[PDB]
Design a protein around this ligand. Structure first.
Ligand code: HEM
Length: 178
């Protein structure tokens, strides 16, 4: 199991912040959750698929999606509507990239009637793990614990955060068999 809470302050925003006061929620398929929902130890739980090895680089898939919603301001439409699927982690020695397919919508955070334009991204790097131990695919297992920073492409997706902002730390050792 690979564990990551994306960002604690983002999960607090969806459930208790300005998104949470206007219909904020999340839903998952294939992915669990453990810990405090708006807390530091809270993390989504990703189950690995069959890994793919290219030398010293493992690409580990994790099936399922995470769907965040919020900001119903009475128009019948969720103005925040953010789906994260096709989770994969590609290791690059001492770092690992977290890859997603997203569907989201842009916003100026002012218009409470009109949903902004759809944005998608396929095989987009969302974050990079500075790994505690370097990833070796020849050992049969990869420890994914480490600290994370937000990518330039996820920073377009999350809007409010800077490029290279810290995200939630990761944990868990997964096997590569399936
Ligand atoms: C009309 C719609 C929206 C309004 C009025 C709005 C307003 C706000 C407000 C008041 C905050 C401050 C909350 C806080 O700091 O605790 C906030 C933060 C934030 N908003 Fe929005 N927002 C809207 C839509 C969106 C959308 C579509 C996104 C999608 C990317 C988004 C992403 C964020 C993020 C990431 C934060 C930072 C949360 C954190 O970690 O503390 N917002 N917004």
């Amino acid at each position: 199991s690979f564990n990551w809470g994306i960002r604690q302050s983002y999960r607090h925003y969806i459930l208790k912040g300005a998104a949470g006061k206007t219909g904020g929620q999340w839903a998952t398929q294939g992915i669990g959750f453990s810990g405090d929902k708006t807390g530091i130890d809270g993390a989504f739980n990703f189950t690995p698929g069959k890994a793919r090895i290219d030398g010293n680089s493992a690409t580990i898939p994790f099936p399922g999606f995470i769907h965040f919603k919020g900001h119903d301001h009475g128009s019948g439409v969720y103005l925040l509507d953010m789906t994260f699927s096709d989770w994969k982690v590609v290791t690059h020695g001492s770092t690992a990239d977290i890859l997603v397919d997203y569907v989201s919508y842009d916003s100026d955070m002012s218009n409470t009637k009109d949903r902004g334009p759809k944005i998608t991204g396929d095989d987009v790097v969302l974050a990079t793990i500075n790994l505690n131990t370097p990833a070796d695919p020849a050992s049969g297992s990869i420890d994914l614990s480490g600290s994370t920073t937000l990518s330039p492409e996820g920073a377009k997706l999350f809007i409010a955060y800077d490029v290279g902002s810290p995200l939630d730390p990761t944990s868990g050792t997964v096997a590569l068999d399936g």
